[PDB]
């Protein structure tokens, strides 16, 4: 749909993934935190190329497509919510219910044949761990857990985070996140010295190809993902050499981090433990359009009561957010941006020269290709196109 046929024909291992430039339809995606959307104050966002409106009504979230059925304007240009349960387009006053998108009234013509006979697209919305997830897809949604990493939804796991818009395709963010050798870019991070981390420069892999990963398609809640097992048989690199001379050392701190790293459809990394031995990182790379993603960062720490939660929140604000989410992951942001040009014409998918640790990235590309729930197309964005046969 999205890429030159001649390129898809070349990438036989993962053509659906290379075609998925706008992301995978029929998955849940986090787009904001619960505390960013207040009762009766609709908010705009773009998800998989689609302009959406989210509102909170009697504390519950509702999602309508931000595009009037009539002349295709964004309702959000001038929001008229004239009754608790409805939104009225500012142009000709086509009025929609938040609950089912049904065109229930038209103030410019209360006798119109369109009334009761059209409906604006709605998407399911669910709040978990103070994060707002939208099911960008069709029909009754699967359970959220299918599209979250293991432990994210644990009862005791306290989730805090940060979200922002990044100028790369979502797939560059996923691959960079799951890339076992990219750890090299983190060698001078403030987190490394200031939280006393052990952090190698890379890995000499060992064992066969199949031993480099654990492909999960046997998970009981339907989760689909890959574990990076490079370090199970691999020798970590702590002295990098050129011409046999040591030019760089890894970090010889006491804190062991990033024991288990896993990537999950639709594009969420779990790093455990990280950025401290008693915490976890869960981060999404959410497709906004072909050029941009939400970098939706979360940190999890099991907490037993309000005392532990408030102390966790204080350390999040004073240490983990500045030192890890920014001080560590900022280098990931510009690493993603640096790949844009090579992949922007889709020729990077052909011309890339991979080495051994990219086996993790290949395993993800195959998993994603085989288990995604649909390819988003420009026609999903504009309006689906089909001719009688």
């Amino acid at each position: 749909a999205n890429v030159d046929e001649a390129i898809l024909k070349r990438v036989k291992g993962w053509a659906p993934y290379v075609d998925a430039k706008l992301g995978f339809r029929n998955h849940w995606y986090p787009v904001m935190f619960s505390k960013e959307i207040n009762e009766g104050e609709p908010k705009t966002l773009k998800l998989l190329g689609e302009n959406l409106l989210v509102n909170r009504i009697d504390g519950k979230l509702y999602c309508l497509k931000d595009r009037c059925l009539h002349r295709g304007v964004q309702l959000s240009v001038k929001v008229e919510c004239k009754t608790k349960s409805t939104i009225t387009c500012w142009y000709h006053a086509w009025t929609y219910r938040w609950e089912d998108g049904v065109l229930c009234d038209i103030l410019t013509n209360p006798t119109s044949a369109q009334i009761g006979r059209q409906k604006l697209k709605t998407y399911p919305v669910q709040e978990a761990k103070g994060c707002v997830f939208i099911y960008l897809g069709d029909g009754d949604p699967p359970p959220l857990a299918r599209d979250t990493p293991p432990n994210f939804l644990d009862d005791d796991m306290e989730i805090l985070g940060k979200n922002q818009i990044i100028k790369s395709n979502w797939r560059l963010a996923v691959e960079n996140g799951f890339d076992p050798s990219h750890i090299y870019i983190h060698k001078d991070s403030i987190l490394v010295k200031d939280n006393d981390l052990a952090l190698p420069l890379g890995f000499a892999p060992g064992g066969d190809r199949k031993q480099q990963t654990r492909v999960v398609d046997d998970d009981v809640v339907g989760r689909k993902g890959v574990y990076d097992l490079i370090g199970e048989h691999g020798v970590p690199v702590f002295e990098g050499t050129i011409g046999g001379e040591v030019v760089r050392e890894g970090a010889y701190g006491e804190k062991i981090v990033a024991n288990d790293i896993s990537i999950w459809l639709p594009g969420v990394l779990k790093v455990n433990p990280f950025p401290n031995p008693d915490m976890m990182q869960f981060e999404w790379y959410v497709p906004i359009d072909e050029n941009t993603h939400y970098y939706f960062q979360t940190l999890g720490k099991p907490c037993a009561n309000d005392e532990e939660r408030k102390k966790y929140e204080q350390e999040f604000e004073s240490k983990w957010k500045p030192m890890a989410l920014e001080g560590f992951n900022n280098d990931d942001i510009w690493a993603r941006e640096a790949m844009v040009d090579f992949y922007a014409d889709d020729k990077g998918w052909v011309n890339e020269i991979l080495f051994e640790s990219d086996e993790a990235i290949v395993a993800w590309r195959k998993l994603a290709s085989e288990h995604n729930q649909g390819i988003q197309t420009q026609a999903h964005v504009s309006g689906l196109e089909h001719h009688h046969h």
Binding site: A113, L384, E385, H388
Partner: protein, 104 residues
């Protein structure tokens, strides 16, 4: 209940006839070979008259945007149409076409 439309010989195969009802929305009658079918005249995607469209077998194409419906089932056949038409029962009696004055 039944509206008298035309003599069945008055319609060639592959042709469409607009039925104006006083005090009600217009109907469209389609002759597909020797069978007759009836729907709402107004396209569900807008305000087009389907009687001004093009019939290709049992599929009516809307003149506004090229949306299309099956004239037997009233179900959409081409984008951008998504809402089914009202189907109206047709009956030929003594070589004369009759349309049911309400939908089925």
């Amino acid at each position: 209940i039944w509206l008298k439309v035309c003599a069945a010989s008055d319609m060639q195969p592959g042709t469409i006839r607009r039925v104006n009802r006083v005090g009600a929305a217009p109907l469209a009658v389609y002759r597909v070979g020797d069978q007759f079918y009836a729907t709402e005249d107004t396209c569900t995607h807008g305000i087009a008259s389907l009687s001004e469209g093009t019939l290709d077998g049992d599929v009516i194409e809307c003149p506004f945007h090229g949306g299309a419906f099956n004239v037997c089932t009233g179900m959409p056949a081409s984008s951008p149409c998504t809402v089914p038409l009202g189907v109206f029962e047709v009956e030929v009696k003594e070589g004369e076409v009759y349309v049911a004055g309400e939908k089925k």
